[PDB]
């Protein structure tokens, strides 16, 4: 059992996965309670009054989604509510909050009351990102760093006496880490830090690359866009291994390549890949969309024999990079080797939970669980 093990497995749940057709629909009762130690509900948002508020009242309240995910506390799972996410991080509103002590003080007391009203065990902070708003370090002031650290302290000071958890999802990018995070403060006060060791590459690069490399590859533009560098950098900056949970993607980054005739890494790209029929987002495909393309549409798979990164797959002018069971096992052995706090997945509804691909239900998440529970390293 994961709950009796020395590791966390932090699973993100997404309310918007309900609005998908056919087998892509995911509801709270699709959560498999044997596969997670912690569930984090994405997302609540920052209202115009500076207070946390539900993003989707129809699902979260009227259809009782908050209650139906908090249900999983009955299995011993800790259920937190996440605030923010990529879309909610587009503007200045989190920066305005954290730079205003009076606004922080109002926010904190209301946020704890909100968590207690719905029965959540904690709050997960998902501002992407302090200073570097949506990765753009030119947008925010340097004082976002101190402001976020003070927000974390003020939340900790209310949550910890009530026995409530406080965590954050954080950037894997050296420049963002340096600009946005007072790492010693966060490492001391947070119960865990979920490092988002994915989205290192995507359509925005204008060339193909892997969503989530584990180790440096000789053709990389930088030495730091890989999970091994990122995790060691969080530790070098002052984070204890026990506080780190390493993110793993249940999806791939897709690309429209300029030329069907070359199809390797670092080749020119004109746009994101064509949207999947279930997830409906250019540049993104769920694992259950990728595995079907490979199994039933003849996409060609290229693996890295040194296992520095997972596979990519292509057909015509479409190309996608993603994690398979093999690289997941390697990544979990890496987690164990460094004695990290555990693993994290984005997100439950993107793995093949329906066994559309015939590899079993939840092939990626089950691979993580099995490797975490395996004593050998």
Ligand X SMILES: C=CCNc1nc(SCc2ccc(Cl)cc2)nc2sc3c(c12)C=CN(C)C3
Peptide bond into 129 cis (omega under 30): yes
Site pattern 148..187 for ligand X (x: CB under 6 A): ----------------------------------------
- Quote the DSSP letter at residue 32: -
**In angstroms, rounded to a whole number, what is the distance separating the alpha carbons of residues 309 and 173?**
17
Q: Which residues of 315-324 are buried (b: 16+ CB within 10 A; e: fewer)?
A: eebbbbbbbb
Binding letters toward ligand X, positions 251-280, x by CB under 6 A: ----------------------------x-
Residue whose CB is less far from ligand NAG, 5 or 228 = 228
Under 8 Å CB-to-CB from 148, ≥6 apart: which residues? 98, 127, 130, 180, 181, 182
CA of residue 163 relative to chain centroid, distance: 25
What residues from 179 to 218 belong to the interface with ligand NAG (CB under 6 A)? Answer: 215-216
Is 19 a binding residue for ligand X by CB under 6 A? The answer is no
116 upstream amide cis, omega within 30 of 0: no
CB of 17 to ligand X, least distance (A): 7
Tokens of 54: 């539900």
CB distance 314 to 326 below 8 Å: no
Backbone angles phi, psi at 300, to 5 degrees: -90, 135
Selecting among 29, 71, 116, 128, the annotated active-site residue is 128
Q: Using only C-alpha atoms, what is the Rg of the chain?
A: 20
CA distance 61 to 294: 39
In the complex, the smallest distance separating the C-beta of residue 231 from ligand NAG, rounded to whole angstroms, is 8
197 neighbors 246 (Cβ within 8 angstroms): yes
Decide whether 267 or 281 has the Cβ nearer to ligand X.
281
**Binding flags for ligand NAG, 226-265, as an x/- string (CB under 6 A):** --xx--x---------------------------------
Dihedral angle computed from the Cα positions of residues 57, 10, 111 and 73, in that order, rounded to the nearest 10 degrees:
80
Candidates 156-164, 196-204, 319-327, 332-340 — which segment interacts with ligand X by CB under 6 A? Answer: 196-204
CB of 193 vs ligand X, minimal distance in Å: 18
Q: Which residue is nearest to ligand X (CB)?
A: 281
Binding to ligand X (CB under 6 A) within 71-100 occurs at: 86
CB atoms within 10 A of CB 76: 12
Q: Which does 167 bind (CB under 5 to 8 A by kind): ligand NAG, ligand X, none?
A: none
Active site residue 128: yes
By CB under 6 A, the residues from 108 to 137 that bind ligand X are 135
Binding of ligand X by 284 (CB under 6 A): yes
Binding mask 302-341 for ligand X (x = CB under 6 A): ----------------------------------------
Residues that bind ligand X (CB under 6 A): 86, 135, 199, 202, 204, 279, 281, 284
Catalytic residues: 128
Residues that bind ligand NAG (CB under 6 A): 215-216, 228-229, 232
């Amino acid at each position: 059992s994961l709950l009796n093990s020395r590791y966390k497995l932090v699973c993100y749940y997404t309310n918007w996965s309900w609005y998908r057709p056919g087998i892509g629909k995911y509801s709270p009762e699709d959560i498999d309670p044997s596969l997670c130690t912690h569930i984090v509900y994405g997302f609540a948002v920052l209202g115009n009054d500076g207070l946390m508020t539900a993003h989707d009242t129809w699902s979260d309240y009227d259809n009782r989604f908050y209650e139906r995910v908090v249900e999983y506390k009955r299995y011993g799972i800790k259920v937190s509510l996440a605030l923010g996410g990529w879309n909610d991080s587009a503007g200045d509103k989190y920066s305005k909050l954290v730079n205003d002590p009076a606004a922080r003080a109002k926010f904190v007391q209301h946020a704890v009351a909100f968590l207690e009203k719905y029965g959540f065990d904690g709050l997960d902070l998902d501002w992407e990102y302090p200073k570097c708003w949506q990765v753009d370090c030119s947008k925010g002031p340097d004082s976002d760093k101190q402001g976020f650290a003070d927000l974390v302290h003020e939340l900790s000071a209310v949550l910890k006496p009530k026995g409530l958890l406080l965590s954050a999802a954080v950037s894997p990018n050296k420049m963002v880490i340096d600009a946005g995070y007072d790492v010693p403060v966060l490492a001391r006060l947070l119960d865990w830090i979920a490092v988002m060791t994915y989205d290192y590459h995507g359509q925005w690069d204008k060339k193909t690359g892997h969503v989530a490399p584990l180790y440096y590859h000789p053709d990389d533009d930088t030495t730091y866009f890989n999970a091994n560098y990122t995790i060691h950098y969080w530790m070098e900056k002052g984070t204890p291994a026990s506080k780190i949970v390493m993110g793993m993607p249940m999806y791939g980054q897709s690309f429209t390549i300029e030329n069907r005739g070359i199809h390797g890494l670092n080749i020119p790209v004109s746009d994101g890949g064509e949207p999947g029929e279930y997830t409906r987002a250019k540049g993104f495909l769920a694992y259950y969309e990728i595995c079907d393309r490979i199994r039933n549409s003849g996409w060609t798979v290229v693996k890295d024999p040194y296992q520095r990164m997972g596979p990519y797959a292509y057909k015509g002018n479409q190309w996608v990079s993603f994690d398979d069971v093999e690289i997941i096992k390697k990544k979990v052995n890496f987690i164990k080797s460094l004695n990290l706090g555990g693993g994290m997945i984005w997100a439950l509804d993107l793995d093949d939970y329906r066994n559309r691909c015939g590899q079993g239900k939840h092939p990626l998440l089950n691979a993580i669980k099995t490797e975490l529970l395996n004593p050998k390293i």
